């Protein structure tokens, strides 16, 4: 078209239509010039990290990318409250993305002073990977997301990837992708860019908390017709052995026969937020549950979904068990406990085992006249036939989706940090400033990004007589309205908000 | 319609049509008044339960519920013998339920005597939870299911459920459900209520015993082309380390390569029915295997499907691993060994590991010059890629179906007490007497219940030359006919009848 006319408009709003939701977010971005237009090898040696668990080999690229993978990008807190309150489930259907109002700047620096002016003959490259031929970095929950507060202008993150490695060295199998080898649509100040996406079928992310515990599904008024072994001896003495069978009934509910059993567990170490209770020695890295791969230990985080604490004790949290979000302005290193937000899994304690507790016992030998019966605790229990479990809940700050690795097999692919597992997630959107002349002009660009997702919902069918637990703000007065700006205009979120409030039967 | 005419007829018979079976059952029932028409909160303290593991909370309701969930309701022994001998598998296709001849009786009480008079005005309210809003208690294998013998008249059991609880007390998440709120149909004496339900698709129950063990599938006449490690030393002495490989062949059949491994196991303690062999100590609760949930140990019963005992030893049973039924007239608490019937799973020992035996061994360390190769026993094992297993068998007395707890994930939902797992089982059928005025006329009802299920079958295609194992009665003289009445007309079931007789290849 022309420079003097707009290439797009500002859409930020959410339409609630029937059982579906349409959420739109338009933001303003600024893309710098990364690596002075160079692809550069990066390994631990360049950074200097000695430890062998941290050995990595990869490449850093001039390209940037857009990460909208976090919920609060697409949902205002009121929309999030209106969602988690009335809905038993939700899931994305369609995705629409528009990139427009390209404004390219050029920086001309004098001795002490820099001068800024537009450049009309300068172009901006953009392309999206539809074939997933490139690495997928959007699933690691990196920073650099679209900001939660629409008036905040954000900086596009830098794109880089990793590959196979031995120490800092590579192997002949290591792959190097040059992103210039992908056909990319080039934009000047008047052009715009858009594409449409379709989410593949994924199950409704459950957004409710079970009311009935697993073991209690029985009927307190009626006996079972199964029997259990009550007494192996008549009384204290010698040669007193006997077998006595009783009925499993509501008087003793622990011994009844059951149809199903709680989900798997991989135990985590228990850390108390009251510091005197914790052990004196340094157990942060030595005592943490870690899965080892190819000789490189890796901490288990967040780990399989498990209840974080027994009922009545909320002071204890699994060491690597739950997601931890930082409060506004929280420092990067060695911040105290009150500066970070520790999420807790208490909703799933119905159908899931406690992350800091054993899964149970197993008999370790043949009890006989010579030797007594013995039992050993179970630390990690794999899947057994007939288990049921709840996946990890998602938060207003948490990731939305994650890419399922391309593999011969996987079980219940739903990602461990929460969200929707997919073998074809929304593509990566790569963007960079086209170099204009190893002598180039110092340059950058800004623009608009509007991402629109169509959410589907599941209505609340419950006949429950007493009122539900709903997410509500506190009426008590404060110096700042929760989920709003302070006197200096810094948007801050008071606490991580979960998705599980409403109740269902088991 | 009218009092002078009946609202239905008496249907009991089983039509064998092609590959399908239509099983019809009709009974006479009696419905009393429960809780004097009140909803009474009940917890362990109100009953007086001290144990922390037995802490429960819930409500007792006036409504009753029909339970046909057990097999012997729909089948006669001869219809069972005709089913299990000629067929490799059966599943329920359709369910028809008809309630007729509702009669209401009012009891008038005087000091001298009590007289019961029919009450025309009173009505019975019956409704079925089609949307599954209410808690499901049919799956717990509770007492109160329809009687084995048609002549016997049974009393409908009271319906109650247990919600969330912390110790004796209830919690905010718990939801109280009122039966009255759901829409229901009221029937007078002339009136009858009937409904038809279609079963969800489910896998055919396997009713055959593999004739081939998982490990012996090999051809006995031929050597494999794969090799194994035969010798790690030449002889006795110093510095004898060497490697020797040999062909895996019929001479040694343990070391051959195999494409499949047996199913999972969670070990149970082994108890002998001969009392002098068992240890002289109280290990009934201490030695049992239990899965801990939310801090409440719940015994593991029956647990994952596993062979009950090694071949050749039938006098050993898993402590909590076998469905146990009582003989006719068995007392409620602390009966001797002979009053009860203990099912044994030895039919599945081909593809499944023995419940009382370790699953196998795994090496615990690297060998070296200074360290011997060490092993340890695997007490429980989760699912691995490539396992196969048989589920637990269904019995004439056992439950049929169970509801799959609604959850984000589950694995092999087939219930652990046996039968067909279903997300949408046959709905609960609730019934009560309508209160007639907190001073109400003493009232109870009676009538007829007719339930009809259509079972689909899988024919026996096998080429086996030698005659099958079959289920037959013994011809030796006895004082009674098994599965018939004694001199006083009491129906007795002498032993549990498994479904697995016919054989298949593995």
């Amino acid at each position, epitope marked *: 078209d022309g420079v003097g006319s707009s290439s797009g408009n500002w859409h930020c709003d959410s339409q609630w239509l029937g059982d579906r939701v349409i959420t739109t977010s338009t933001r303003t971005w600024a893309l710098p010039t990364y690596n002075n237009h160079l692809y550069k090898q990066i390994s631990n040696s360049t950074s200097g990290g000695s430890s062998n668990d941290n050995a990595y080999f990869g490449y850093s690229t001039p390209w940037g990318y857009f990460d909208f993978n976090r919920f609060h990008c697409h949902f205002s807190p009121r929309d999030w409250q209106r969602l988690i309150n009335n809905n038993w489930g939700f899931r994305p259907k369609r995705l629409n993305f528009k990139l427009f109002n390209i404004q390219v700047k050029e920086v001309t620096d004098n001795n002490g002073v820099k001068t800024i002016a537009n450049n009309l003959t300068s172009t901006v490259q953009v392309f999206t990977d539809s074939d997933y031929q490139l690495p997928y970095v959007l699933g690691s929950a990196h920073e650099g997301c679209l900001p939660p507060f629409p008036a905040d202008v954000f900086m596009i993150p830098q794109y880089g990837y990793l590959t196979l490695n031995d120490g800092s060295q590579a192997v002949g199998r290591s792959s190097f992708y040059c992103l210039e080898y992908f056909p990319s649509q080039m934009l000047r100040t008047g052009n715009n860019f858009q594409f449409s996406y379709e989410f593949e079928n994924v199950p409704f992310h459950s957004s409710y908390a079970h009311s009935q515990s697993l073991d209690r599904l029985m009927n307190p008024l009626i006996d079972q017709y199964l029997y259990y072994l009550s007494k192996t001896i008549n009384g204290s003495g010698q040669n007193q052995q006997t077998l006595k069978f009783s009925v499993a009934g509501p008087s003793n509910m622990a011994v009844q026969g059951r149809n199903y059993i709680p989900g798997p567990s991989y135990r985590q170490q228990r850390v108390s937020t009251t510091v005197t209770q914790n*052990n004196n*020695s*340094e157990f942060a890295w*030595p005592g943490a549950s870690s899965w080892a791969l190819n000789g490189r230990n890796s901490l288990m985080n967040p780990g399989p979904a498990m209840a974080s604490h027994k009922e009545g004790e909320d002071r204890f949290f699994p060491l690597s068990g739950s997601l931890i979000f930082g409060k506004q302005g929280t420092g990067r290193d060695n911040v105290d406990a009150d500066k970070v937000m520790i999420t807790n899994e208490e909703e799933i304690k119905t159908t899931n085992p406690v992350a800091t507790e054993s899964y149970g016992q*197993v008999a*370790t030998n043949h009890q006989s006249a*010579q030797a*007594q019966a*013995q*039992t*050993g*605790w*179970v*630390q*990690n*229990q794999g899947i057994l036939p007939g288990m049921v479990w709840q996946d990890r809940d998602v938060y207003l700050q948490g990731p939305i989706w994650a890419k399922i690795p391309h593999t011969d097999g996987n079980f219940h692919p739903s990602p461990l940090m929460g969200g929707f597992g997919m073998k074809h997630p929304p593509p990566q959107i790569l963007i960079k400033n086209t170099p204009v002349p190893n002598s180039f002009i110092t340059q950058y660009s800004t623009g608009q990004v509007s991402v629109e997702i169509e959410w589907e919902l599941q209505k609340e069918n419950s006949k429950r007589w007493n009122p539900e637990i709903q997410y509500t703000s506190n009426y008590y007065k404060s110096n700042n309205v929760e989920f709003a700006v302070n006197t200096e205009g810094v948007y801050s979120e008071p606490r991580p908000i979960g998705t599980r409030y409403l109740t269902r039967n088991l | 319609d009218g009092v002078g005419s009946s609202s239905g007829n008496w249907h009991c018979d089983s039509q064998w049509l092609g590959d399908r079976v239509i099983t019809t059952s009709t009974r006479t029932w009696a419905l009393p008044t429960y809780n004097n028409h009140l909803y009474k909160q009940i917890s362990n303290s109100t009953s007086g339960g001290s144990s922390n593991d037995n802490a429960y909370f819930g409500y007792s309701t006036p409504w009753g519920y029909f339970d046909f969930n057990r097999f012997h309701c729909h089948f006669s022994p001869r219809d069972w013998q005709r089913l299990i001998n000629n067929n490799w598998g059966f599943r329920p296709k359709r369910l028809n339920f008809k309630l007729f001849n509702i009669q209401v009786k009012e009891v008038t009480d005087n000091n001298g005597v009590k007289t019961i008079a029919n009450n025309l005005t009173s009505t019975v309210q019956v409704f079925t939870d089609s949307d599954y809003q209410l808690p499901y208690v049919l799956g717990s294998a509770h007492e109160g299911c329809l009687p084995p013998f048609p002549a016997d008249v049974f009393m409908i059991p009271q319906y109650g459920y247990l919600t969330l609880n912390d110790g004796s007390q209830a919690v905010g998440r718990s939801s109280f459900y009122c039966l009255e709120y759901f829409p229901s149909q009221m029937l007078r004496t002339g009136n009858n209520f009937q409904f038809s339900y279609e079963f969800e698709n489910v896998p055919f129950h396997s009713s055959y015993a593999h004739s081939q063990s998982l490990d012996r599938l090999m051809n006995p006449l031929i050597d494999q082309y794969l090799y194994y490690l035969s010798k790690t030393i030449n002889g006795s002495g110093q510095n004898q380390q060497t490697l020797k490989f040999s062909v895996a062949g019929p001479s040694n059949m343990a070391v051959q390569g195999r494409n499949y491994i047996p199913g999972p196991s969670y*070990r149970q303690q082994r108890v002998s029915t001969t009392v002098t062999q068992n240890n002289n100590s109280e290990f009934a609760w201490p030695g049992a295997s239990s899965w801990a949930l939310n801090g409440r140990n719940s015994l593991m019963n029956p647990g994952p499907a596993m062979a009950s005992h090694k071949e050749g030893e039938d006098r050993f049973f898993p402590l909590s691993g076998s469905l146990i039924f009582g003989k006719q007239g068995t007392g409620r608490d602390n009966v001797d060994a002979d009053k009860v019937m203990i099912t044994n799973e030895e039919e599945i020992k081909t593809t499944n590991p023995v419940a009382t035996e370790s699953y196998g061994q*795994v090496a*615990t*360390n690297h060998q*070296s010059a*200074q*360290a*011997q190769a060490q092993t*340890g*026993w*695997v*007490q*429980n*094992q989760g699912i691995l890629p490539g396992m196969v297993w048989q589920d637990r068998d269904v019995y004439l007395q056992g439950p049929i179906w169970a509801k799959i707890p609604h959850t984000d994930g589950n694995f092999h939902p087939s219930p652990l007490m046996g039968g067909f797992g279903m997300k949408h089982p046959p709905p609960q059928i609730l019934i009560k007497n309508t209160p007639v005025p907190n001073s109400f006329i003493t009232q109870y009802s009676t009538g007829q219940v007719s339930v009809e299920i259509e079972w689909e079958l899988q024919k026996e295609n096998s080429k086996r030359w030698n005659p099958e194992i079959q289920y037959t009665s013994n011809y030796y003289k006895s004082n009674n006919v098994e599965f018939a009445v004694n001199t006083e007309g009491v129906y007795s079931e002498p032993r549990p009848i498994g479904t697995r007789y016919l054989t298949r290849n593995l």
Partner: antibody
Amino acid sequence: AVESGGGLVKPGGPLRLSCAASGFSLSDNYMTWIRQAPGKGLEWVSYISSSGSFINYADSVKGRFTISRDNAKNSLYLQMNSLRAEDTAVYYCARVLSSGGLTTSWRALWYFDVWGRGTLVTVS
Amino acid sequence: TVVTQEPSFSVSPGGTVTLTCGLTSGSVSTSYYPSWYQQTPGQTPRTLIYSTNIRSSGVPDRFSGSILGNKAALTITGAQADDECDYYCVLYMGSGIWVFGGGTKLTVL
């Protein structure tokens, strides 16, 4: 076939005696030093983790002795410093097996499984 | 934190005597893992039993060790000439610290 032996030091001075390792690796095993005065009692002296990140001492010898475990040489070094006449006694190189059961079915027990023959160290 | 057991326990052959070692500061149980070590004079001490009831591979079944009452103790049944030598008691507590008892011998008559 596991067993070991201790290092021999002269009486009358602070040294570091060694515990050699035969039949097993000191890497994956929890190791402890036990010292007994002749004719009276056995007293715990020091403990070292298999990862070695956890080390703890007896109050009498705490803040004094220092333990070090060399995996490559299969030797367990305990350095005693600034000895006292009350440190005169026999030392054992105990091997402790903690929770011998496998992870799926684990039992936690703590006891001294293997005992190196005692060597006397006198302060004089 | 001082282990307590009685120094004097003499039993004639063919007689089973119980040795009881407890903790003065607090009551014992499985959590405070008990153990029993015989020290045969002229030789290094060998673990008689460990973690209450469990019996070491080498040890005989004549003597059984169990936690009876507040403080766990070994219970030798029908003692014989061989089993007699200096005994010591020890229960694990805290992290990496064990406390030993005063020691006891026993003698055939």
